[PDB]
Ligand binder design. Structure first.
Ligand SMILES: Cc1ccc(Cc2cc(=O)n3c(c2[NH+](C)C)SC[C@H]3C(=O)O)c2ccccc12
Ligand SMILES: Cc1ccc(Cc2cc(=O)n3c(c2[NH+](C)C)SC[C@H]3C(=O)O)c2ccccc12
Ligand code: NA
Ligand code: NA
Lengths: 230, 231
Protein backbone atom coordinates (compact mmCIF):
# COMPACT_ATOMS: atom_id res chain seq x y z
CA UNK A 1 0.00 0.00 0.00
CA UNK A 2 2.03 2.98 1.25
CA UNK A 3 5.59 1.81 1.88
CA UNK A 4 7.11 5.26 2.37
CA UNK A 5 4.62 5.86 5.15
CA UNK A 6 5.26 2.47 6.77
CA UNK A 7 8.96 3.25 6.64
CA UNK A 8 8.27 6.67 8.20
CA UNK A 9 6.07 5.07 10.90
CA UNK A 10 9.00 2.88 11.97
CA UNK A 11 11.48 5.77 11.91
CA UNK A 12 9.22 7.60 14.35
CA UNK A 13 8.71 4.58 16.59
CA UNK A 14 12.40 3.67 16.68
CA UNK A 15 13.16 7.33 17.58
CA UNK A 16 10.91 7.47 20.60
CA UNK A 17 7.66 8.71 19.06
CA UNK A 18 4.55 6.71 19.96
CA UNK A 19 1.08 6.53 18.39
CA UNK A 20 -1.80 8.35 19.99
CA UNK A 21 -5.44 7.37 19.61
CA UNK A 22 -7.94 10.11 19.05
CA UNK A 23 -11.70 9.85 18.83
CA UNK A 24 -14.28 11.71 16.77
CA UNK A 25 -14.62 15.44 17.43
CA UNK A 26 -11.19 15.54 19.05
CA UNK A 27 -8.75 18.18 17.82
CA UNK A 28 -5.32 16.75 17.20
CA UNK A 29 -4.11 20.33 17.11
CA UNK A 30 -5.97 23.56 17.61
CA UNK A 31 -5.86 27.22 16.61
CA UNK A 32 -5.24 28.45 20.20
CA UNK A 33 -2.11 26.46 21.10
CA UNK A 34 1.12 28.49 21.39
CA UNK A 35 3.03 25.40 20.22
CA UNK A 36 2.85 24.05 16.67
CA UNK A 37 3.07 20.41 15.67
CA UNK A 38 3.85 18.06 12.79
CA UNK A 39 1.10 15.47 12.64
CA UNK A 40 1.77 12.08 11.05
CA UNK A 41 -1.75 10.85 10.64
CA UNK A 42 -1.21 7.13 10.19
CA UNK A 43 -4.84 5.93 10.04
CA UNK A 44 -8.27 7.54 10.04
CA UNK A 45 -9.91 10.62 8.54
CA UNK A 46 -9.70 14.28 9.65
CA UNK A 47 -10.81 17.69 8.56
CA UNK A 48 -9.02 21.01 8.80
CA UNK A 49 -11.35 23.73 10.09
CA UNK A 50 -11.32 27.46 10.92
CA UNK A 51 -13.62 28.93 13.61
CA UNK A 52 -14.29 32.60 12.98
CA UNK A 53 -15.14 34.89 15.91
CA UNK A 54 -18.68 34.62 14.55
CA UNK A 55 -18.42 31.04 15.80
CA UNK A 56 -19.19 29.88 12.31
CA UNK A 57 -17.06 26.81 11.56
CA UNK A 58 -15.42 26.47 8.17
CA UNK A 59 -14.40 23.16 6.61
CA UNK A 60 -11.24 23.71 4.61
CA UNK A 61 -9.57 20.40 3.71
CA UNK A 62 -9.95 16.69 4.30
CA UNK A 63 -7.12 14.33 5.08
CA UNK A 64 -6.88 10.57 5.48
CA UNK A 65 -4.14 8.40 6.89
CA UNK A 66 -1.41 8.07 6.00
CA UNK A 67 -0.46 11.75 5.57
CA UNK A 68 1.41 14.58 7.24
CA UNK A 69 -0.24 17.82 8.34
CA UNK A 70 1.90 20.58 9.80
CA UNK A 71 0.36 23.39 11.78
CA UNK A 72 3.45 25.56 11.77
CA UNK A 73 6.25 26.53 9.47
CA UNK A 74 9.29 24.28 9.67
CA UNK A 75 11.80 27.18 9.91
CA UNK A 76 9.99 29.71 12.15
CA UNK A 77 7.81 27.10 13.98
CA UNK A 78 4.98 29.69 13.99
CA UNK A 79 1.43 29.04 12.82
CA UNK A 80 0.56 28.58 9.11
CA UNK A 81 -3.00 29.57 9.86
CA UNK A 82 -5.55 29.52 12.71
CA UNK A 83 -6.59 25.95 12.21
CA UNK A 84 -7.86 22.88 13.91
CA UNK A 85 -7.48 19.27 12.76
CA UNK A 86 -10.74 17.49 13.85
CA UNK A 87 -11.16 13.69 13.80
CA UNK A 88 -14.21 12.68 11.77
CA UNK A 89 -13.71 8.93 11.61
CA UNK A 90 -14.58 7.05 14.80
CA UNK A 91 -10.91 6.82 15.77
CA UNK A 92 -7.72 8.10 14.29
CA UNK A 93 -4.17 7.11 15.08
CA UNK A 94 -1.65 9.99 14.90
CA UNK A 95 1.94 10.64 15.94
CA UNK A 96 2.30 14.16 17.32
CA UNK A 97 5.64 15.86 17.01
CA UNK A 98 6.73 19.28 18.07
CA UNK A 99 7.84 21.13 14.97
CA UNK A 100 11.26 21.80 16.46
CA UNK A 101 11.96 18.09 17.15
CA UNK A 102 10.93 17.27 13.57
CA UNK A 103 13.76 19.41 12.20
CA UNK A 104 16.49 17.30 13.84
CA UNK A 105 15.17 13.98 12.58
CA UNK A 106 14.58 15.06 8.99
CA UNK A 107 18.31 15.88 9.05
CA UNK A 108 19.39 12.26 9.56
CA UNK A 109 17.22 10.79 6.78
CA UNK A 110 17.18 12.30 3.31
CA UNK A 111 14.54 9.66 2.58
CA UNK A 112 12.05 10.70 5.21
CA UNK A 113 12.66 14.39 4.50
CA UNK A 114 11.65 13.65 0.91
CA UNK A 115 8.57 11.73 2.04
CA UNK A 116 7.20 14.69 4.00
CA UNK A 117 8.23 17.17 1.32
CA UNK A 118 6.37 15.12 -1.23
CA UNK A 119 3.16 15.33 0.82
CA UNK A 120 3.26 19.10 0.81
CA UNK A 121 3.72 18.91 -2.94
CA UNK A 122 0.63 16.78 -3.25
CA UNK A 123 -1.38 19.27 -1.21
CA UNK A 124 -0.20 22.18 -3.33
CA UNK A 125 -1.14 20.49 -6.61
CA UNK A 126 -4.46 19.26 -5.10
CA UNK A 127 -5.64 22.80 -4.36
CA UNK A 128 -4.55 24.02 -7.77
CA UNK A 129 -6.45 21.20 -9.52
CA UNK A 130 -9.60 21.83 -7.43
CA UNK A 131 -9.28 25.55 -8.21
CA UNK A 132 -9.05 24.73 -11.91
CA UNK A 133 -12.03 22.37 -11.89
CA UNK A 134 -14.01 25.04 -10.09
CA UNK A 135 -12.99 27.66 -12.65
CA UNK A 136 -14.06 25.40 -15.49
CA UNK A 137 -17.33 23.93 -14.16
CA UNK A 138 -18.29 25.65 -10.95
CA UNK A 139 -19.72 23.82 -7.95
CA UNK A 140 -20.41 20.89 -10.27
CA UNK A 141 -16.67 20.50 -10.74
CA UNK A 142 -16.29 20.77 -7.00
CA UNK A 143 -18.84 18.09 -6.06
CA UNK A 144 -17.91 15.73 -8.87
CA UNK A 145 -14.32 16.10 -7.75
CA UNK A 146 -15.24 15.28 -4.18
CA UNK A 147 -17.18 12.25 -5.38
CA UNK A 148 -14.47 11.18 -7.80
CA UNK A 149 -11.94 11.10 -4.99
CA UNK A 150 -14.35 9.18 -2.76
CA UNK A 151 -14.91 6.69 -5.57
CA UNK A 152 -11.20 6.18 -6.17
CA UNK A 153 -10.17 5.82 -2.56
CA UNK A 154 -13.20 4.17 -0.90
CA UNK A 155 -15.07 2.63 -3.82
CA UNK A 156 -15.72 -1.14 -4.01
CA UNK A 157 -17.64 -2.61 -6.95
CA UNK A 158 -20.99 -4.19 -6.06
CA UNK A 159 -24.12 -4.94 -8.14
CA UNK A 160 -25.66 -1.52 -7.49
CA UNK A 161 -22.44 0.07 -8.84
CA UNK A 162 -19.38 1.42 -7.03
CA UNK A 163 -20.36 1.45 -3.38
CA UNK A 164 -18.69 4.04 -1.17
CA UNK A 165 -17.26 2.03 1.77
CA UNK A 166 -17.10 4.66 4.51
CA UNK A 167 -18.92 4.15 7.79
CA UNK A 168 -22.31 5.83 7.66
CA UNK A 169 -21.41 8.28 10.41
CA UNK A 170 -18.38 9.31 8.35
CA UNK A 171 -20.54 9.81 5.24
CA UNK A 172 -22.95 12.20 6.93
CA UNK A 173 -20.01 14.33 8.07
CA UNK A 174 -18.74 14.73 4.49
CA UNK A 175 -22.18 15.82 3.34
CA UNK A 176 -23.99 12.53 2.58
CA UNK A 177 -28.64 25.00 -0.52
CA UNK A 178 -26.49 25.61 -3.60
CA UNK A 179 -25.00 22.15 -3.18
CA UNK A 180 -28.52 20.72 -3.16
CA UNK A 181 -29.46 22.23 -6.53
CA UNK A 182 -26.81 19.88 -8.01
CA UNK A 183 -26.94 16.63 -6.02
CA UNK A 184 -30.47 16.12 -7.36
CA UNK A 185 -29.22 16.51 -10.93
CA UNK A 186 -26.96 13.58 -10.09
CA UNK A 187 -29.42 11.45 -8.09
CA UNK A 188 -31.82 11.88 -11.02
CA UNK A 189 -29.29 11.44 -13.79
CA UNK A 190 -28.20 8.24 -11.94
CA UNK A 191 -24.58 9.29 -11.64
CA UNK A 192 -24.93 8.38 -7.98
CA UNK A 193 -27.60 6.26 -6.28
CA UNK A 194 -28.73 6.24 -2.71
CA UNK A 195 -30.20 2.75 -2.20
CA UNK A 196 -30.44 0.68 0.99
CA UNK A 197 -28.91 3.37 3.22
CA UNK A 198 -25.66 3.24 1.24
CA UNK A 199 -24.25 5.51 -1.45
CA UNK A 200 -23.39 4.04 -4.87
CA UNK A 201 -21.64 5.61 -7.89
CA UNK A 202 -23.05 4.38 -11.17
CA UNK A 203 -21.34 6.59 -13.77
CA UNK A 204 -17.67 7.18 -13.11
CA UNK A 205 -17.16 8.78 -16.53
CA UNK A 206 -19.45 11.67 -15.70
CA UNK A 207 -17.42 12.43 -12.57
CA UNK A 208 -14.27 12.30 -14.68
CA UNK A 209 -15.79 14.63 -17.27
CA UNK A 210 -16.54 17.50 -14.92
CA UNK A 211 -13.53 17.09 -12.61
CA UNK A 212 -10.88 16.65 -15.27
CA UNK A 213 -8.09 18.39 -13.44
CA UNK A 214 -8.65 16.52 -10.16
CA UNK A 215 -8.74 13.33 -12.24
CA UNK A 216 -5.33 14.28 -13.63
CA UNK A 217 -4.08 15.16 -10.15
CA UNK A 218 -5.10 11.73 -8.95
CA UNK A 219 -3.39 9.97 -11.89
CA UNK A 220 -0.18 11.88 -11.20
CA UNK A 221 -0.31 11.74 -7.40
CA UNK A 222 -1.83 8.29 -6.70
CA UNK A 223 -1.36 6.28 -9.90
CA UNK A 224 -1.66 2.98 -8.04
CA UNK A 225 -5.17 3.88 -6.95
CA UNK A 226 -6.13 5.65 -10.18
CA UNK A 227 -5.46 2.51 -12.22
CA UNK A 228 -7.82 0.34 -10.16
CA UNK A 229 -10.73 1.96 -12.03
CA UNK A 230 -9.22 3.11 -15.36
CA UNK B 1 15.34 39.04 1.46
CA UNK B 2 17.87 37.20 3.65
CA UNK B 3 17.03 33.49 3.70
CA UNK B 4 16.68 33.64 -0.11
CA UNK B 5 19.97 35.46 -0.50
CA UNK B 6 21.33 32.61 1.63
CA UNK B 7 19.85 30.07 -0.82
CA UNK B 8 21.05 31.93 -3.92
CA UNK B 9 24.59 31.80 -2.48
CA UNK B 10 24.20 28.06 -1.93
CA UNK B 11 23.14 27.55 -5.54
CA UNK B 12 25.89 29.63 -7.15
CA UNK B 13 28.36 27.95 -4.80
CA UNK B 14 27.32 24.57 -6.27
CA UNK B 15 27.56 25.70 -9.85
CA UNK B 16 24.02 26.85 -10.71
CA UNK B 17 23.69 30.04 -12.71
CA UNK B 18 20.98 32.68 -13.14
CA UNK B 19 19.26 32.88 -16.51
CA UNK B 20 17.19 35.70 -17.95
CA UNK B 21 13.77 35.17 -19.36
CA UNK B 22 11.53 37.64 -21.04
CA UNK B 23 7.86 38.33 -20.88
CA UNK B 24 5.93 35.49 -22.50
CA UNK B 25 8.65 32.86 -22.33
CA UNK B 26 7.94 29.60 -20.41
CA UNK B 27 10.55 28.69 -17.81
CA UNK B 28 9.06 25.16 -17.81
CA UNK B 29 6.18 23.77 -19.82
CA UNK B 30 3.58 21.06 -19.49
CA UNK B 31 4.86 18.86 -22.42
CA UNK B 32 8.47 18.49 -21.35
CA UNK B 33 9.03 15.05 -19.76
CA UNK B 34 11.88 16.47 -17.68
CA UNK B 35 10.90 18.20 -14.42
CA UNK B 36 12.64 21.13 -12.69
CA UNK B 37 13.15 22.99 -9.47
CA UNK B 38 12.91 26.70 -10.26
CA UNK B 39 14.32 29.27 -7.88
CA UNK B 40 12.82 32.39 -9.24
CA UNK B 41 15.03 35.13 -7.90
CA UNK B 42 13.45 38.19 -9.53
CA UNK B 43 10.42 38.95 -11.67
CA UNK B 44 6.76 38.01 -11.78
CA UNK B 45 5.35 34.79 -13.26
CA UNK B 46 2.10 32.90 -13.56
CA UNK B 47 1.41 29.20 -13.57
CA UNK B 48 -0.91 28.14 -16.35
CA UNK B 49 -2.76 25.13 -17.65
CA UNK B 50 -4.53 24.17 -20.87
CA UNK B 51 -7.56 22.01 -21.54
CA UNK B 52 -8.18 19.93 -24.66
CA UNK B 53 -9.29 23.09 -26.52
CA UNK B 54 -6.37 25.48 -26.33
CA UNK B 55 -7.97 27.35 -23.41
CA UNK B 56 -5.40 29.10 -21.16
CA UNK B 57 -6.15 29.02 -17.40
CA UNK B 58 -4.22 31.31 -15.03
CA UNK B 59 -3.84 29.38 -11.77
CA UNK B 60 -1.31 31.12 -9.53
CA UNK B 61 1.07 34.06 -9.53
CA UNK B 62 4.61 33.92 -8.17
CA UNK B 63 7.17 36.67 -7.62
CA UNK B 64 10.87 36.43 -6.92
CA UNK B 65 12.17 35.24 -4.53
CA UNK B 66 10.25 31.95 -4.65
CA UNK B 67 10.64 28.26 -5.47
CA UNK B 68 8.40 26.42 -7.93
CA UNK B 69 8.81 22.70 -8.52
CA UNK B 70 7.22 21.04 -11.54
CA UNK B 71 7.87 17.52 -10.37
CA UNK B 72 7.63 15.51 -7.20
CA UNK B 73 10.89 15.39 -5.27
CA UNK B 74 10.95 11.59 -4.80
CA UNK B 75 9.46 10.19 -8.04
CA UNK B 76 10.60 13.15 -10.21
CA UNK B 77 7.37 12.96 -12.26
CA UNK B 78 4.96 15.76 -12.99
CA UNK B 79 2.81 17.36 -10.26
CA UNK B 80 0.49 18.65 -12.93
CA UNK B 81 0.49 19.71 -16.59
CA UNK B 82 1.61 23.20 -15.90
CA UNK B 83 3.57 26.02 -17.52
CA UNK B 84 5.38 28.79 -15.72
CA UNK B 85 5.09 31.94 -17.85
CA UNK B 86 6.95 35.22 -17.37
CA UNK B 87 4.67 38.24 -17.05
CA UNK B 88 7.19 40.90 -15.96
CA UNK B 89 9.46 42.25 -18.71
CA UNK B 90 12.36 40.22 -17.37
CA UNK B 91 12.69 37.48 -14.80
CA UNK B 92 15.82 35.92 -13.35
CA UNK B 93 15.62 32.25 -12.48
CA UNK B 94 17.94 29.43 -11.40
CA UNK B 95 16.88 26.22 -13.14
CA UNK B 96 17.75 22.90 -11.50
CA UNK B 97 16.94 19.45 -12.79
CA UNK B 98 15.08 17.57 -10.11
CA UNK B 99 17.61 14.69 -10.08
CA UNK B 100 20.57 17.07 -10.08
CA UNK B 101 18.83 19.01 -7.30
CA UNK B 102 17.98 16.11 -5.02
CA UNK B 103 21.53 15.63 -3.70
CA UNK B 104 21.89 19.36 -2.91
CA UNK B 105 18.93 19.52 -0.52
CA UNK B 106 20.39 16.34 0.92
CA UNK B 107 23.55 18.19 1.96
CA UNK B 108 22.05 21.27 3.71
CA UNK B 109 19.03 21.04 5.97
CA UNK B 110 19.09 24.82 6.27
CA UNK B 111 18.57 25.17 2.60
CA UNK B 112 16.30 22.21 2.35
CA UNK B 113 14.25 23.95 4.94
CA UNK B 114 13.94 27.19 3.05
CA UNK B 115 12.36 25.31 0.13
CA UNK B 116 10.14 23.21 2.40
CA UNK B 117 8.82 26.39 4.01
CA UNK B 118 7.95 27.77 0.58
CA UNK B 119 5.63 24.87 -0.19
CA UNK B 120 3.99 25.37 3.20
CA UNK B 121 3.43 29.03 2.34
CA UNK B 122 1.71 27.96 -0.90
CA UNK B 123 -0.51 25.40 0.77
CA UNK B 124 -1.79 27.88 3.36
CA UNK B 125 -2.18 30.64 0.71
CA UNK B 126 -4.52 28.38 -1.24
CA UNK B 127 -6.50 27.46 1.87
CA UNK B 128 -6.84 31.12 2.95
CA UNK B 129 -7.97 32.11 -0.56
CA UNK B 130 -10.52 29.31 -0.42
CA UNK B 131 -11.65 30.42 3.05
CA UNK B 132 -12.14 34.01 1.87
CA UNK B 133 -14.16 32.93 -1.16
CA UNK B 134 -16.38 30.75 0.99
CA UNK B 135 -17.07 33.74 3.24
CA UNK B 136 -17.40 36.49 0.62
CA UNK B 137 -17.60 35.06 -2.83
CA UNK B 138 -16.04 36.81 -5.78
CA UNK B 139 -15.66 40.01 -3.72
CA UNK B 140 -13.43 38.23 -1.21
CA UNK B 141 -11.23 36.93 -4.04
CA UNK B 142 -11.06 40.33 -5.69
CA UNK B 143 -10.23 42.13 -2.48
CA UNK B 144 -7.72 39.43 -1.52
CA UNK B 145 -5.78 39.89 -4.76
CA UNK B 146 -5.84 43.66 -4.35
CA UNK B 147 -4.84 43.20 -0.70
CA UNK B 148 -1.72 41.32 -1.58
CA UNK B 149 -0.85 43.62 -4.42
CA UNK B 150 -1.08 46.48 -2.00
CA UNK B 151 1.04 44.84 0.64
CA UNK B 152 3.82 43.76 -1.73
CA UNK B 153 3.90 46.64 -4.23
CA UNK B 154 2.18 49.49 -2.37
CA UNK B 155 3.87 52.69 -1.19
CA UNK B 156 2.19 55.10 1.20
CA UNK B 157 1.57 58.52 -0.35
CA UNK B 158 -0.74 61.49 0.33
CA UNK B 159 -2.93 60.26 -2.59
CA UNK B 160 -3.22 56.83 -0.94
CA UNK B 161 -1.32 53.62 -1.46
CA UNK B 162 0.29 53.70 -4.88
CA UNK B 163 0.84 50.37 -6.63
CA UNK B 164 4.49 50.54 -7.67
CA UNK B 165 4.05 48.36 -10.75
CA UNK B 166 3.78 49.43 -14.39
CA UNK B 167 0.44 49.47 -16.15
CA UNK B 168 1.85 46.65 -18.29
CA UNK B 169 2.21 44.21 -15.45
CA UNK B 170 -1.06 45.46 -14.01
CA UNK B 171 -2.95 44.28 -17.09
CA UNK B 172 -1.36 40.79 -16.96
CA UNK B 173 -2.89 40.62 -13.47
CA UNK B 174 -5.97 42.26 -15.04
CA UNK B 175 -6.59 46.05 -14.75
CA UNK B 176 -15.31 42.12 -18.22
CA UNK B 177 -17.97 39.73 -16.93
CA UNK B 178 -21.17 41.21 -15.53
CA UNK B 179 -20.67 39.75 -12.04
CA UNK B 180 -17.13 41.10 -11.81
CA UNK B 181 -18.35 44.41 -13.21
CA UNK B 182 -20.80 44.96 -10.36
CA UNK B 183 -18.02 44.40 -7.84
CA UNK B 184 -15.70 46.73 -9.74
CA UNK B 185 -18.42 49.37 -9.73
CA UNK B 186 -18.86 48.92 -6.00
CA UNK B 187 -15.11 49.32 -5.46
CA UNK B 188 -14.46 52.04 -8.05
CA UNK B 189 -17.55 53.68 -6.53
CA UNK B 190 -16.36 53.48 -2.92
CA UNK B 191 -12.97 54.78 -4.11
CA UNK B 192 -11.27 51.61 -2.85
CA UNK B 193 -8.89 51.77 -5.80
CA UNK B 194 -8.67 54.77 -8.09
CA UNK B 195 -6.88 55.16 -11.40
CA UNK B 196 -5.17 58.53 -11.32
CA UNK B 197 -2.28 60.04 -13.30
CA UNK B 198 -1.51 56.82 -15.22
CA UNK B 199 -1.19 55.19 -11.79
CA UNK B 200 -3.18 52.90 -9.49
CA UNK B 201 -4.02 54.08 -5.96
CA UNK B 202 -5.66 52.28 -3.03
CA UNK B 203 -7.62 54.62 -0.75
CA UNK B 204 -9.65 52.17 1.36
CA UNK B 205 -7.33 49.46 2.62
CA UNK B 206 -9.63 48.82 5.60
CA UNK B 207 -12.24 47.63 3.09
CA UNK B 208 -9.82 45.12 1.46
CA UNK B 209 -8.81 43.82 4.89
CA UNK B 210 -12.53 43.58 5.68
CA UNK B 211 -13.53 41.26 2.86
CA UNK B 212 -10.22 39.30 2.62
CA UNK B 213 -9.84 38.42 6.28
CA UNK B 214 -8.18 35.07 5.93
CA UNK B 215 -5.71 36.14 3.28
CA UNK B 216 -4.92 39.06 5.57
CA UNK B 217 -4.11 36.57 8.34
CA UNK B 218 -2.10 34.49 5.86
CA UNK B 219 0.10 37.48 5.00
CA UNK B 220 0.59 38.24 8.70
CA UNK B 221 1.67 34.70 9.52
CA UNK B 222 3.71 34.23 6.37
CA UNK B 223 5.11 37.70 5.59
CA UNK B 224 5.03 39.59 8.91
CA UNK B 225 7.75 42.08 8.00
CA UNK B 226 5.85 43.17 4.90
CA UNK B 227 2.45 43.08 6.58
CA UNK B 228 3.57 45.46 9.36
CA UNK B 229 4.55 48.07 6.77
CA UNK B 230 0.85 48.88 6.35
CA UNK B 231 -0.33 47.84 9.77
C1 LIG C 1 -13.57 13.10 -0.34
C2 LIG C 1 -12.13 13.55 -0.19
C3 LIG C 1 -11.59 14.45 -1.10
C4 LIG C 1 -10.28 14.89 -1.00
C5 LIG C 1 -9.45 14.45 0.01
C6 LIG C 1 -8.04 14.96 0.08
C7 LIG C 1 -6.96 14.00 -0.34
C8 LIG C 1 -7.19 12.70 -0.72
C9 LIG C 1 -6.15 11.76 -1.13
O1 LIG C 1 -6.40 10.59 -1.46
N1 LIG C 1 -4.81 12.21 -1.15
C10 LIG C 1 -4.59 13.53 -0.76
C11 LIG C 1 -5.58 14.46 -0.36
N2 LIG C 1 -5.22 15.72 -0.01
C12 LIG C 1 -4.42 15.79 1.29
C13 LIG C 1 -4.58 16.48 -1.17
S1 LIG C 1 -2.88 13.87 -0.86
C14 LIG C 1 -2.50 12.41 -1.88
C15 LIG C 1 -3.61 11.43 -1.52
C16 LIG C 1 -3.20 10.54 -0.35
O2 LIG C 1 -3.75 10.83 0.79
O3 LIG C 1 -2.39 9.64 -0.58
C17 LIG C 1 -9.95 13.54 0.95
C18 LIG C 1 -9.17 13.02 2.04
C19 LIG C 1 -9.66 12.11 2.98
C20 LIG C 1 -10.99 11.66 2.88
C21 LIG C 1 -11.79 12.14 1.84
C22 LIG C 1 -11.29 13.08 0.86
C1 LIG D 1 -1.38 40.15 -6.57
C2 LIG D 1 -0.74 38.86 -6.10
C3 LIG D 1 -1.44 38.00 -5.25
C4 LIG D 1 -0.90 36.81 -4.80
C5 LIG D 1 0.38 36.43 -5.17
C6 LIG D 1 0.93 35.12 -4.65
C7 LIG D 1 1.95 35.24 -3.55
C8 LIG D 1 2.42 36.44 -3.07
C9 LIG D 1 3.41 36.57 -2.00
O1 LIG D 1 3.81 37.67 -1.59
N1 LIG D 1 3.94 35.39 -1.42
C10 LIG D 1 3.45 34.18 -1.93
C11 LIG D 1 2.49 34.03 -2.96
N2 LIG D 1 2.11 32.78 -3.35
C12 LIG D 1 3.18 32.01 -4.11
C13 LIG D 1 1.48 32.00 -2.20
S1 LIG D 1 4.22 32.87 -1.07
C14 LIG D 1 4.80 33.93 0.30
C15 LIG D 1 4.94 35.29 -0.35
C16 LIG D 1 6.35 35.44 -0.93
O2 LIG D 1 6.41 35.64 -2.21
O3 LIG D 1 7.30 35.37 -0.15
C17 LIG D 1 1.12 37.26 -6.02
C18 LIG D 1 2.45 36.94 -6.46
C19 LIG D 1 3.20 37.77 -7.31
C20 LIG D 1 2.64 38.97 -7.77
C21 LIG D 1 1.36 39.32 -7.37
C22 LIG D 1 0.57 38.48 -6.49
NA1 NA E 1 -2.02 25.43 16.48
NA1 NA F 1 6.86 20.15 -17.09
Amino acid sequence: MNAQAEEFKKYLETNGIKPKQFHKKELIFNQWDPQEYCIFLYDGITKLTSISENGTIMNLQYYKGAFVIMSGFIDTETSVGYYNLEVISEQATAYVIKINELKELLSKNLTHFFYVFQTLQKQVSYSLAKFNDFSINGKLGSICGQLLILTYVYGKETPDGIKITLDNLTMQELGYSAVSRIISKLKQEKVIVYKNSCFYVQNLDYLKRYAPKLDEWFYLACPATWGKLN
